[PDB]
Ligand binder design. Structure first.
Ligand SMILES: *[C@@H]1O[C@H](CO[C@@H]2O[C@@H](C)[C@@H](O)[C@@H](O)[C@@H]2O)[C@@H](O[C@@H]2O[C@H](CO)[C@@H](O)[C@H](O)[C@H]2NC(C)=O)[C@H](O)[C@H]1NC(C)=O
Ligand SMILES: *[C@@H]1O[C@H](CO[C@@H]2O[C@@H](C)[C@@H](O)[C@@H](O)[C@@H]2O)[C@@H](O[C@@H]2O[C@H](CO)[C@@H](O)[C@H](O)[C@H]2NC(C)=O)[C@H](O)[C@H]1NC(C)=O
Ligand SMILES: CCCCN[C@@H](Cc1c[nH]c2ccccc12)C(=O)NCC[C@H]1CC[C@H](N(C)C)CC1
Ligand SMILES: *[C@@H]1O[C@H](CO[C@@H]2O[C@@H](C)[C@@H](O)[C@@H](O)[C@@H]2O)[C@@H](O)[C@H](O)[C@H]1NC(C)=O
Ligand SMILES: *[C@@H]1O[C@H](CO)[C@@H](O)[C@H](O)[C@H]1NC(C)=O
Ligand SMILES: *[C@@H]1O[C@H](CO)[C@@H](O)[C@H](O)[C@H]1NC(C)=O
Ligand SMILES: *[C@@H]1O[C@H](CO)[C@@H](O)[C@H](O)[C@H]1NC(C)=O
Length: 526
């Protein structure tokens, strides 16, 4: 229960899972805490310790603003931090099977949260089930978010940008140098993440310094080519300066400003982080990944178009109702407490919320493409139309476009369409299969019969858990034993994908073909 690592020994704890044992190492540091002079800087390597580090509780979560739109509501508060917020926050967790495996495949989770929020200690990121059921090692890390993680003065090493991405990268190399001591195989490492974590995974495929740190990639409801995923260098410096003025650190040496921001307290930075965005939407990434010339050597849409990425297998997918989650955070006429039937005027007001800096012609083209009804008389026409708009534009169509262009360079790609609505889902039914609510099924939470899931959900999570693990281990996300539907590869031509539900798992073709031709081919012009 004590493992010797390259920086010192760590003590774990035993866990009882499904009549078996999993050994958990919660809260292993992987960098010098980025405090004082080290704020906004790339993570510094960690120096030796001679103690026995007790890794028996989740460590701090990094500083972040917290969702307060629904106090006391589990649907929003399950995503909020469940440990103390602190700049001292670069730690990681390890779940290994008991008894110690000999050469186990490693799954590295990268959480999402719009690059502004998130923590690895969330209940739905508990990797003890995957270690128990599939005999893999699960690793997750905290990375810096918000301004503290992605504030950028491009070229300036006091604030170069992409610090959170380098946090992730340093965790990946920790697994490279250390996971063998835990019985893991550093040569079979599979990254997987959701939303902003899925966008991080896709950027690790593009950044050269990470190509040796992992084997395969899984992308859940996100990719770097999504419109929220990358901050342009214009936007990047404009928001850094807005933050500088908003806290009285405005100056003209550019290191000037960083040293002044370095002595403000974290809560002041977090307070003014919220307002640096000129055209703010619920999907706005206040401080995100930039083209920094270090992690990102070029504009990532160019690298993807010209095949400049790690050649390997990918598993990509999306949920049925990606967009609904965001409609009750700003769209008029929407509420989680009624059926949110909205009118045409409310739909048009919703597009101005989600596309504030867009042409009036652009907004009409959105309404033109999405308001051709099979039924002029269905009252929920506009309600669902706005949800599909936000989902197709921000998540579904960028993920499909990333998969085609990645597969065009010869690698096996697998695409899924998750359409099961959790039986325990706390949000209303009109929101459907929401953004982020496949995560629990991936992590095997319905396998716990103690916790209120239907038996069909147990079998569905059990099959997903096998497909994900077979993808990590073997690069082929099949369930080979129980007469399952064979998951075909995604090709540029036929574009086959697998649907995941409790009823019938089916092969289908060309997901959202018409909608995505609008968003990917035409809309980038307006
Ligand atoms: C940070 O950006 C805002 C927004 O700039 C506008 O929007 C851009 C997308 C682009 O169209 C620019 O040419 C525009 O100037 C800067 O300016 C504010 O812009 C908004 C709307 O235009 C509005 O609040 C004010 O007119 C502008 N405020 C001021 C003080 O001029 C803002 O100044 C930028 N931050 C800087 C320059 O430090
Ligand atoms: C659904 O609810 C929204 C939100 O209204 C709030 O939540 C309700 C459940 C109730 O507690 C209200 O008192 C709250 O104000 C409704 O949107 C509001 O509608 C009224 C009248 O149309 C309008 O004056 C407000 O500005 C609206 N709030 C907005 C746009 O944010 C909506 O009408 C409800 N729809 C249905 C079908 O019940
Ligand atoms: C004007 C600047 C706004 C701040 N910018 C964003 C930061 C962000 C957080 N999560 C993201 C997910 C994607 C993109 C971006 C974000 C923001 O706070 N959105 C409103 C808050 C809630 C938070 C929970 C989300 N899901 C659980 C549904 C929905 C939105
Ligand atoms: C590290 O932990 C040592 C042993 O702790 C044991 O496990 C924890 C979970 C508690 O139940 C404790 O009562 C057990 O004895 C400690 O002896 C040691 O002091 C700890 N080190 C530090 C620096 O706190
Ligand atoms: C683990 O597997 C790799 C190949 O993936 C092999 O090179 C390595 O020697 C193995 N280590 C063991 C069995 O300890
Ligand atoms: C001010 O800027 C110069 C370059 O313009 C830089 O060399 C110097 O270090 C900056 N000031 C401080 C205190 O670092
Ligand atoms: C296969 O089916 C059996 C029941 O016959 C079930 O117990 C098992 O969990 C299933 N395995 C997978 C990987 O779904």
């Amino acid at each position: 229960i004590i493992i010797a690592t390259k920086n010192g020994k760590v003590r774990g704890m035993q866990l009882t899972v499904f009549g078996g044992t999993v050994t958990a190492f919660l809260g292993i540091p992987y960098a010098q805490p980025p405090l004082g002079r080290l704020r906004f800087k790339k993570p510094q390597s960690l120096t030796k310790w001679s103690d026995i580090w007790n890794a028996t509780k989740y460590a701090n979560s990094c500083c972040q603003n917290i969702d307060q739109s629904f106090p006391g509501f589990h649907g929003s508060e399950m995503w909020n931090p469940n440990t103390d917020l602190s700049e001292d926050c670069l730690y990681l967790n390890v779940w290994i099977p008991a008894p110690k495996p000999k050469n186990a495949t490693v799954l590295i989770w990268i959480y999402g949260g719009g690059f502004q929020t998130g923590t690895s200690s969330l209940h739905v990121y508990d990797g003890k089930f995957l270690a128990r059921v599939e005999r893999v090692i699960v690793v997750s890390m905290n990375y810096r978010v918000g301004a503290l993680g992605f504030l950028a003065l491009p070229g300036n090493p006091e604030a170069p940008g992409n610090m959170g991405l380098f946090d992730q990268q340093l965790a990946l190399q920790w697994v490279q140098k250390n996971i063998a001591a835990f019985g893991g195989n550093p040569k079979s490492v599979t990254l997987f993440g959701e939303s902003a974590g899925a966008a991080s995974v896709s950027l690790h495929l593009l950044s050269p310094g990470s190509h040796s740190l992992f084997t395969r990639a899984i992308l859940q409801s996100g990719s770097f080519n999504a419109p929220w995923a990358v901050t342009s260098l214009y936007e990047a410096r404009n928001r850094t300066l807005n933050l500088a003025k908003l806290t009285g650190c405005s100056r003209e040496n550019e290191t000037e400003i960083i040293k002044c921001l370095r002595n403000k307290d974290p809560q002041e930075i977090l307070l003014n982080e919220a307002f640096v965005v000129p055209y703010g939407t619920p999907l706005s990434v206040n401080f995100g990944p930039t083209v920094d010339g270090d992690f990102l050597t070029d504009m990532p849409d160019i690298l993807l178009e010209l095949g400049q990425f790690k050649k390997t297998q990918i598993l990509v997918g999306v949920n049925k109702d990606e967009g609904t989650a965001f409609l009750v955070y700003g769209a008029p006429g929407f509420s989680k407490d009624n059926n949110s039937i909205i009118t045409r005027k409310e739909f048009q007001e919703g597009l101005k919320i989600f596309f504030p800096g867009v042409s009036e012609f652009g907004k009409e083209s959105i309404l033109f493409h999405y308001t051709d009804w099979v039924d002029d008389q269905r009252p929920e026409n506009y309600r669902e139309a706005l949800g599909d708009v936000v989902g197709d534009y921000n998540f579904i169509c960028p993920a499909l476009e990333f998969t085609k262009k990645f597969s065009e360079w010869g690698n096996n790609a697998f695409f899924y369409y998750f359409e099961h609505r959790s039986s325990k889902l706390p949000w209303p039914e009109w929101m459907g299969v929401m953004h982020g609510y496949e995560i629990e099924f991936v992590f095997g939470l319905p396998l716990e019969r103690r916790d209120q899931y239907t038996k069909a959900e147990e079998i569905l999570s059990r099959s997903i858990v096998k497909r994900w693990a077979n993808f990590a281990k073997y690069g082929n996300p099949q369930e080979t034993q129980n007469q399952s539907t064979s998951w075909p590869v995604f090709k540029s031509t036929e574009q086959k994908y697998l649907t995941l539900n409790t009823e019938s798992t089916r092969i289908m073709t060309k997901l959202r073909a018409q909608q995505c031709r609008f968003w990917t081919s035409f809309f980038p012009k307006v």
